[PDB]
Every structure is written in structure tokens, then in C-alpha cells.
Write a protein that binds this ligand. Structure first.
Ligand SMILES: CC(=O)N[C@H]1[C@H](O[C@H]2[C@@H](O)[C@@H](CO)O[C@@H](O[C@H]3[C@H](O)[C@@H](O)[C@H](O)O[C@@H]3CO)[C@@H]2O)O[C@H](CO)[C@@H](O[C@@H]2O[C@H](CO)[C@H](O)[C@H](O)[C@H]2O)[C@@H]1O
Length: 164
């Protein structure tokens, strides 16, 4: 299991815990989403370089929502949004600034989503966790992806930093 396991085609399912799902989206827009329809709704929006700030109305888990996006740099920005009730609107949360079309997600046994936040450029690239349990919720990976055991996290980080 030294070889990078994948790629697998886009899919929605109750993904197993303790794996990093390393997505490699070719386009932009909504690349990841999950909800338990009760306490957590989350998605990630991929924004291309040189994107003037604007509002877009997009499909998130078959609901249309209006969000502000921007990318004033020359690299990719993966931006997370979440909310914790059906009546709330989404809030922009963490983001990954990266020269690679790569982000990764892990759901731990407590049901929490982790992914990569910050950037190599600013020296704060880190695994962050949303302490918002959603065990057994359907995860949408809207991208080709690879599967890395989370005992091999440093290998995932190396891909996030340097590409495939
Ligand atoms: C865990 C996490 O998401 N950390 C983020 C940090 O999140 C904080 C932010 O969402 C604020 C918004 O008000 O809420 C914080 O939680 C508070 C609860 O909402 C509140 O009810 C409770 O009483 O107190 C909690 C603690 O204050 C939440 O933790 O937000 C910062 C700023 O955006 C993030 O850091 C930024 O991360 C990006 C990459 O994603 C870059 O690295 C930026 O340089 C960095 O500032 C932090 O990761």
C-alpha cells in the first residue's frame, strides 16, 4: 500500500472512517459536501486564481445557496463553508491556499471531518478538525480521489504540499 490507491471516480457514500480521501478536482466549484440534516452542513468550494470578489448562486446538496467567493492570488483556494442548523445561512470558515488541485478529507471514529487548512506559503499548513460529528452521513466527493490510510497521514501531507 505504498502505491497511491486510486484514482476513483466521483462518488457519494457513507465513507469509512480513518482514511484520507485525497480529491483531485479538474474544474472548480463544489468539490466536497456532507450533512446529517440536523446539526451540520458543510461544503468546500474550489476557486480559481485571479477571481474578483463576486457572489454566485450554486448547488450545494440540491439546495441553491448564494455565497461570496474571491481569490486575489495566483494559486488555488479551497474554501470551506458550514452551518449548524437548517434555518441558518452558511458561514465561510477555513481555507487551503495551494498550487495544487488537491485537498483531503478524513472522518474520524467520533464522526468529525478533518481537512487541510492554511498554506505552505504562509507557513501554517495544518490538519484542522471541525468538531461537528456526522458519523454515517453521506459524503459527496465531487472529484476523482485517492484513498490513504490515516496512519499514513504524513504521506497525505506530502501530496498536499507537493502534488501527486
Ligand atoms: C477550529 C477553527 O475553525 N479555527 C479557525 C478559527 O475559527 C474560529 C472562528 O470561526 C470564530 C468565528 O467567530 O469562531 C471560533 O469559535 C468560537 C465559537 O464560535 C464561540 O461560540 C465560542 O464561544 O468561542 C469559540 C472560540 O473563539 C472559531 O474557532 O478562525 C480562524 C480565523 O478565520 C482560523 O484561522 C485562519 O485559518 C486560515 C486557514 O483556514 C488561515 O490560516 C488564516 O491565516 C487563519 O487566521 C482558524 O483556523
Amino acid at each position: 500500500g505504498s502505491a497511491l490507491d486510486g484514482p476513483y471516480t466521483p462518488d457519494s457514500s457513507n465513507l469509512p472512517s480513518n482514511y484520507w480521501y485525497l480529491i483531485n478536482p479538474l474544474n472548480d466549484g463544489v468539490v466536497f459536501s456532507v450533512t446529517n440534516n440536523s446539526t451540520f452542513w458543510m461544503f468546500t468550494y474550489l476557486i480559481l486564481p485571479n477571481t474578483a470578489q463576486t457572489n454566485v448562486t450554486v448547488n450545494v446538496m440540491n439546495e441553491t445557496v448564494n455565497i461570496s467567493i474571491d481569490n486575489s492570488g495566483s494559486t488555488y483556494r479551497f474554501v470551506d463553508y458550514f452551518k449548524t442548523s437548517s434555518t441558518q445561512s452558511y458561514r465561510q470558515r477555513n481555507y487551503l491556499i495551494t498550487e495544487h488541485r488537491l485537498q483531503a478529507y478524513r472522518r474520524d471514529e467520533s464522526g468529525n471531518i478533518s481537512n487541510y487548512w492554511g498554506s505552505s506559503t504562509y507557513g501554517d499548513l495544518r490538519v484542522g478538525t471541525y468538531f461537528n460529528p456526522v458519523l454515517n452521513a453521506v459524503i459527496n466527493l465531487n472529484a476523482d480521489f485517492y484513498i490513504i490510510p490515516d496512519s499514513q497521514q504524513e504521506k497525505c501531507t506530502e501530496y498536499i504540499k507537493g502534488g501527486l
